[PDB]
Amino acid sequence: MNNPAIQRIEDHIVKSPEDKREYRGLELANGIKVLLISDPTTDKSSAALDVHIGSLSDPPNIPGLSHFCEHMLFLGTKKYPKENEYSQFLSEHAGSSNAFTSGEHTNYYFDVSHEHLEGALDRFAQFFLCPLFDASCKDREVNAVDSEHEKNVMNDAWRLFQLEKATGNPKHPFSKFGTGNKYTLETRPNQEGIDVREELLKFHSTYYSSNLMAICVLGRESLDDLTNLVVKLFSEVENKNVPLPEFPEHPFQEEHLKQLYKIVPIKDIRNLYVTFPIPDLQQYYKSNPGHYLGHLIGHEGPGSLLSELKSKGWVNTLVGGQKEGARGFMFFIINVDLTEEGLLHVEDIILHMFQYIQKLRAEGPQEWVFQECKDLNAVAFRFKDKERPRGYTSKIAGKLHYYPLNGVLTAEYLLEEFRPDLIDMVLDKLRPENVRVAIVSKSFEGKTDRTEQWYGTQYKQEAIPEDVIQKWQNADLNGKFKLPTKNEFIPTNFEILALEKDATPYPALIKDTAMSKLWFKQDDKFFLPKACLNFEFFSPFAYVDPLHCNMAYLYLELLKDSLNEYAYAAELAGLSYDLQNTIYGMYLSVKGYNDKQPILLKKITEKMATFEIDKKRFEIIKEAYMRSLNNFRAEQPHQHAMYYLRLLMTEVAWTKDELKEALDDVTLPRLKAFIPQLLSRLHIEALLHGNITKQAALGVMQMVEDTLIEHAHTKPLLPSQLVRYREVQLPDRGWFVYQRRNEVHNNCGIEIYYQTDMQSTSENMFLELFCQIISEPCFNTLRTKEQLGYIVFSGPRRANGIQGLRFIIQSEKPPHYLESRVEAFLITMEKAIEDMTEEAFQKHIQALAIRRLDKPKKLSAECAKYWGEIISQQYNYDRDNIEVAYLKTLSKDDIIKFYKEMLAVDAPRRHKVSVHVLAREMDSCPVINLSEAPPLPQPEVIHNMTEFKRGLPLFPLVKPH
Numbered sequence: 014m015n016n017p018a019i020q021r022i023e024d025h026i027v028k029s030p031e032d033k034r035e036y037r038g039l040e041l042a043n044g045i046k047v048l049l050i051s052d053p054t055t056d057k058s059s060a061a062l063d064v065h066i067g068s069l070s071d072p073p074n075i076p077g078l079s080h081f082c083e084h085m086l087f088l089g090t091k092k093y094p095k096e097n098e099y100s101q102f103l104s105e106h107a108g109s110s111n112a113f114t115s116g117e118h119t120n121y122y123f124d125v126s127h128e129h130l131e132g133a134l135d136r137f138a139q140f141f142l143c144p145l146f147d148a149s150c151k152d153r154e155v156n157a158v159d160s161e162h163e164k165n166v167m168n169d170a171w172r173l174f175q176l177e178k179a180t181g182n183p184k185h186p187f188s189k190f191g192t193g194n195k196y197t198l199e200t201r202p203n204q205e206g207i208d209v210r211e212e213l214l215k216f217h218s219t220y221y222s223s224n225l226m227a228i229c230v231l232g233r234e235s236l237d238d239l240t241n242l243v244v245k246l247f248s249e250v251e252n253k254n255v256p257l258p259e260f261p262e263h264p265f266q267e268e269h270l271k272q273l274y275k276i277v278p279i280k281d282i283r284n285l286y287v288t289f290p291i292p293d294l295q296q297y298y299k300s301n302p303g304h305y306l307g308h309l310i311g312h313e314g315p316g317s318l319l320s321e322l323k324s325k326g327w328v329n330t331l332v333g334g335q336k337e338g339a340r341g342f343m344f345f346i347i348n349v350d351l352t353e354e355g356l357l358h359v360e361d362i363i364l365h366m367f368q369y370i371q372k373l374r375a376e377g378p379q380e381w382v383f384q385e386c387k388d389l390n391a392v393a394f395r396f397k398d399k400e401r402p403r404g405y406t407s408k409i410a411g412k413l414h415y416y417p418l419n420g421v422l423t424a425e426y427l428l429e430e431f432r433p434d435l436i437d438m439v440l441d442k443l444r445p446e447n448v449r450v451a452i453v454s455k456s457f458e459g460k461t462d463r464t465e466q467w468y469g470t471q472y473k474q475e476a477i478p479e480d481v482i483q484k485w486q487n488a489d490l491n492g493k494f495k496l497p498t499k500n501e502f503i504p505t506n507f508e509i510l511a512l513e514k515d516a517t518p519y520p521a522l523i524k525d526t527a528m529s530k531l532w533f534k535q536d537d538k539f540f541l542p543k544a545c546l547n548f549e550f551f552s553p554f555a556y557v558d559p560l561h562c563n564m565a566y567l568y569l570e571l572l573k574d575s576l577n578e579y580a581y582a583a584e585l586a587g588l589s590y591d592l593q594n595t596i597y598g599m600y601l602s603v604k605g606y607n608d609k610q611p612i613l614l615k616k617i618t619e620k621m622a623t624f625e626i627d628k629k630r631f632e633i634i635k636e637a638y639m640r641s642l643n644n645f646r647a648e649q650p651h652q653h654a655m656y657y658l659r660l661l662m663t664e665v666a667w668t669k670d671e672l673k674e675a676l677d678d679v680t681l682p683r684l685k686a687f688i689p690q691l692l693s694r695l696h697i698e699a700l701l702h703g704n705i706t707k708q709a710a711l712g713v714m715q716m717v718e719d720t721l722i723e724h725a726h727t728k729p730l731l732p733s734q735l736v737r738y739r740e741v742q743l744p745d746r747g748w749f750v751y752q753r754r755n756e757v758h759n760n761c762g763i764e765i766y767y768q769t770d771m772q773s774t775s776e777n778m779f780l781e782l783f784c785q786i787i788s789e790p791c792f793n794t795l796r797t798k799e800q801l802g803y804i805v806f807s808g809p810r811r812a813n814g815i816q817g818l819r820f821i822i823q824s825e826k827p828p829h830y831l832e833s834r835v836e837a838f839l840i841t842m843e844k845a846i847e848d849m850t851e852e853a854f855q856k857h858i859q860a861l862a863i864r865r866l867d868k869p870k871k872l873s874a875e876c877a878k879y880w881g882e883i884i885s886q887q888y889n890y891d892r893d894n895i896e897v898a899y900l901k902t903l904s905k906d907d908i909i910k911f912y913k914e915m916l917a918v919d920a921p922r923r924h925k926v927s928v929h930v931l932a933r934e935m936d937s938c939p940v941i942n943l944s945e946a947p948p949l950p951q952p953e954v955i956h957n958m959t960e961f962k963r964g965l966p967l968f969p970l971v972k973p974h
């Protein structure tokens with residue numbers, strides 16, 4: 014028998030034969046389910062604990078208690094009473110942490126340096142043993158939750174989520190507000206005489222029980238050592254024998270069925286949401302009835318429901334399938350975005366959905382379809398990409414609550430039994446008398462009478478008239494809806510090609526022509542049957558002016574539009590592609606199983622070189638683009654700041670306004686004329702990386718090359734004759750502010766940029782070590798202590814061979830206040846670096862070292878790494894070893910000089926730019942315990958981006974390695 018704290022050990026966890034990680038399952042005596050993962054190669058260790066309790070178990074009068082419970086646990090325990098002991102420890106050992114509260118789950122996860130798993134896991138363990146719940150930390154963290162709510166309060170996705178809850182059964186726990194805010198965690202409690210500190214203590218002591226807990230730990234140590242460690246730390250978690258909450262009666266009764274919801278969005282979008290309440294299908298995980306139906310109703314491709322709706326000019330995109338609810342209840346949704354025509358024919362669109370559903374009922378479940386999904390799921394599991402520890406443990410900890418230890422890995426991938434009975438059972442629920450429909454359009458603006466209390470959402474609620482219902486009930490069968498045919502893109506050749514004699518550890522330049530520059534690497538470490546095919550097409554006509562930019566974007570959107578129907582089989586079969594316009598031409602990437610890449614790439618390049626535009630498509634795609642450009646105003650204020658800075662700092666950059674102004678000049682004949690120009694002269698720089706040979710890479714390149722030459726008559730464009738844009742050089746001691754208004758959000762967005770110098774090994778690590786040092790104290794000071802907002806980011810910015818320190822904050826406080834507090838933080842940090850020990854400094858060096866050396870676990874990750882060196886034309890493939898080596902030579906003084914030279918308010922080489930994106934009603938003027946803010950100069954206010962650039966020098970381009 015095993016250790017007295019372990020009920021049983023599952024030594025045979027089902028994994029992929031490809032997976033070298035060793036697994037072991039445990040069920041501790043206190044009811045904790047545990048999965049241990051041993052990876053002797055891993056650079057970062059990780060652990061996650063998932064409590065099977067969430068927002069649905071919140072007290073009636075206190076919405077968002079479990080979410081707020083999550084927040085507090087980071088801030089002090091009995092063994093470790095320091096407010097930021099946990100995060101500070103992790104930061105100083107190359108780690109990070111995070112947590113989310115769902116309806117039924119509170120998931121706590123972290124990663125850390127593999128040399129320090131025990132110490133990190135100890136501090137983590139104490140969260141579930143002896144939480145402190147400090148009153149000083151409570152009255153501050155309330156702001157962070159309120160700011161978290163105020164960030165998502167203008168988000169369309171979050172408004173619709175709560176609106177669905179608030180329109181169900183009010184008595185049902187589903188209707189409860191999960192996030193929480195200042196009003197529910199501090200305000201209203203201080204009126205009824207409720208003690209939230211005792212309620213947080215109440216919730217933890219009632220619900221945080223070891224019988225409702227699951228853990229996953231990944232480390233370098235052996236399975237036996239990981240066993241002893243988890244036992245030693247988590248065996249003494251108090252079992253409170255809490256019954257697992259269950260919600261068997263559906264929150265959506267017949268009084269909530271056959272209802273229509275007119276909703277006013279924040280962005281100018283048009284969306285249709287069709288919802289069917291279904292029973293909890295979780296028990297049927299190894300047959301997946303709902304996902305068989307989701308695969309067919311959500312299918313894109315010939316004969317599919319979308320294809321038809323798209324061809325009628327009503328709908329562009331379609332999401333279909335099972336949506337989770339909580340133990341006891343689920344949903345089946347069909348979501349589509351609408352065209353202008355679609356909005357008028359909402360009723361007609363829903364009729365078409367029921368015609369497809371009725372076809373499924375008539376046709377009956379198809380063994381071969383389920384068998385197709387079975388095969389691809391099984392390929393998807395076997396050849397699955399090795400995961401990042403932090404996300405892997407988090408996911409597993411959640412899955413442990415649902416499946417047997419031995420089957421926690423295979424569960425949602427491997428299907429077992431075809432069950433036609435279960436499919437028909439669910440399909441029977443997809444009926445007009447069972448629908449809930451939601452139209453989301455700015456057309457309803459000002460004509461609503463109901464308001465959702467938590468978000469302020471403006472909506473109308475009415476019943477669907479029985480005559481409309483009957484029309485949907487009496488829907489016949491359409492000849493234009495037809496079942497999908499055999500997926501010919503299903504991969505069958507998984508042979509890993511022998512590593513060639515010439516093989517290199519970095520991408521090698523195997524082709525150097527005027528037409529094409531070809532970088533290639535055969536994979537020497539992942540040995541999965543996959544390849545990444547990356548192509549950058551250089552044409553000067555793609556970004557010459559806003560109009561041609563618009564035409565380049567539109568060409569590729571219409572191209573993907575006409576390929577989607579064909580390319581969807583491939584996406585299902587693990588073969589994906591990406592096609593988008595750049596500031597230098599076009600970007601094409603094909604990733605996935607190598608087998609049938611040539612066929613897909615062949616058709617894409619063929620369609621590129623012989624593209625014939627459909628008129629109706631053009632008008633629809635153009636309208637969607639015009640509307641898309643207008644919708645950027647409704648984006649987050651911090652996203653606005655980042656965007657405008659990117660424009661400010663580049664020699665040539667067409668603004669959002671400039672593009673939409675020039676879009677009405679785009680016509681079909683003009684777009685038709687444009688394509689032959691784009692393709693007439695091209696240079697291609699490519700990276701082909703993975704399970705392919707030298708011969709195979711060159712054969713791929715020739716096919717793209719010769720297809721363009723044979724169809725589009727492409728002539729080589731010399732690289733030396735390709736003009737590249739440079740970054741704006743800020744003057745020494747200068748401070749510039751660009752001021753824009755966001756007219757939707759009641760929060761402001763700020764980006765403060767301190768430009769340093771051109772990227773080089775030295776300057777790169779100066780910035781990166783400084784950033785590492787200030788990383789957690791920025792979060793602890795500006796957010797945790799000062800409570801400036803939920804979004805407080807600090808790190809290195811890299812663009813156009815240039816770099817610098819950036820701060821990104823979203824806040825209800827004005828930008829000028831944010832500015833002062835960031836500057837106060839920089840003062841505090843300099844003294845911190847001055848005062849800190851020589852061994853605390855070496856921790857930061859060692860911490861950043863591990864982060865930079867942290868090896869890619871999968872092909873695409875190593876590919877994107879190499880692609881970055883190609884894009885920037887720096888070709889520094891051994892960057893990490895060189896830069897870490899230099900980092901270790903750095904002393905406190907090096908960083909002190911760097912700060913004094915480049916970053917201090919008095920710095921002789923401070924290069925400061927700031928983007929201030931104003932809140933809706935907020936002001937428009939540049940102009941107590943807290944640590945003191947220094948005096949700041951008067952900024953130069955940028956009114957014209959173009960003028961601003963014209964008056965400044967530009968940087969050189971970075972030398973190739």
Ligand SMILES: Nc1ncnc2c1ncn2[C@@H]1O[C@H](COP(=O)(O)OP(=O)(O)OP(=O)(O)O)[C@@H](O)[C@H]1O
Nearest residue numbers: 400401864867868869870871873874875876877878
């Ligand atoms: N939604 C997505 N679709 C397609 N590819 C994605 C998507 N998300 C991530 N990727 C790819 O996977 C990579 C992300 O890898 P991730 O950061 O999880 O691990 P990693 O890069 O190996 O990190 P490390 O090297 O530190 O271990 C990206 O480089 C990107 O190419």
